[PDB]
Amino acid sequence: GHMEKLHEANNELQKKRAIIEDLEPRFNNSSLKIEELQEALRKKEEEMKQMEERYKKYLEKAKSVIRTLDPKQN
Amino acid sequence: GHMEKLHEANNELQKKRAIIEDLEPRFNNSSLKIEELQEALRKKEEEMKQMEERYKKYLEKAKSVIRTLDPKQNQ
């Protein structure tokens, strides 16, 4: 047949059309997601570096409170 | 005539085939990516939980000291 091969071809085109319309919004969503997961990851890793700044500075501060309050040197 | 319609259709098929063949591995990679990231991020919110627990620890030693040396508690 010839008429019958046009039918098989047009239907497969409708099939691929449906495959594409379903997968595209999915792939777009998942792209957005990867971006926000990395802004969260970056923003968290920054918080962690600050958190280490503070505890570090705290320990150094208490190092000098010890000197100030020690009688054996003051 | 009919020749041309079956040629236009078969070549549109190869177009859509190319679209799909290119997007599908991309979408698979990105599904794996989302879950690798979400893992890294929860291993990181954990590391943070430990570090805030450690800093809150130290911040309550510190006010313990601010209270004992409070002039008002020494009179």
Side-chain angles (χ1 to χ4, degrees), chain B residues 23-24 32 37 61 64 75:
Chain B
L23 177 50
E24 262 175 7
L32 191 73
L37 290 187
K61 283 186 175 176
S64 271
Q75 260 157 12

Side-chain angles (χ1 to χ4, degrees), chain A residues 2 12-13 16 20 23 27 30 34 37-38 41 44-45 48 51-52 54-55 58-59 62, chain B residues 2 12-13 16-17 19-20 23 27 30 33-34 37-38 41 44-45 51-52 54-55 58 62:
Chain A
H2 142 70
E12 210 190 8
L13 276 174
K16 304 211 149 152
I20 292 178
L23 175 69
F27 178 63
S30 109
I34 290 182
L37 287 192
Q38 278 172 321
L41 200 55
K44 199 59 133 179
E45 176 60 21
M48 192 166 310
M51 194 53 124
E52 228 54 33
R54 298 168 74 193
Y55 180 90
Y58 224 146
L59 299 194
Chain B
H2 65 90
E12 186 80 333
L13 273 173
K16 291 179 165 3
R17 196 173 287 114
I19 301 181
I20 293 170
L23 177 50
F27 180 55
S30 71
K33 186 66 149 190
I34 282 173
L37 290 187
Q38 258 164 352
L41 178 73
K44 235 55 175 166
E45 303 172 324
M51 182 75 210
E52 316 170 297
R54 172 169 199 200
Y55 184 93
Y58 205 77

Side-chain angles (χ1 to χ4, degrees), chain B residues 50-61:
Chain B
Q50 291 203 28
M51 182 75 210
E52 316 170 297
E53 257 159 36
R54 172 169 199 200
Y55 184 93
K56 180 186 105 187
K57 246 33 174 160
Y58 205 77
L59 160 65
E60 289 279 300
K61 283 186 175 176

Side-chain angles (χ1 to χ4, degrees), chain A residues 58-62 64-70 73:
Chain A
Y58 224 146
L59 299 194
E60 175 227 327
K61 284 177 172 183
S64 59
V65 162
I66 300 292
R67 211 297 170 185
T68 282
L69 302 186
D70 210 11
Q73 33 209 40

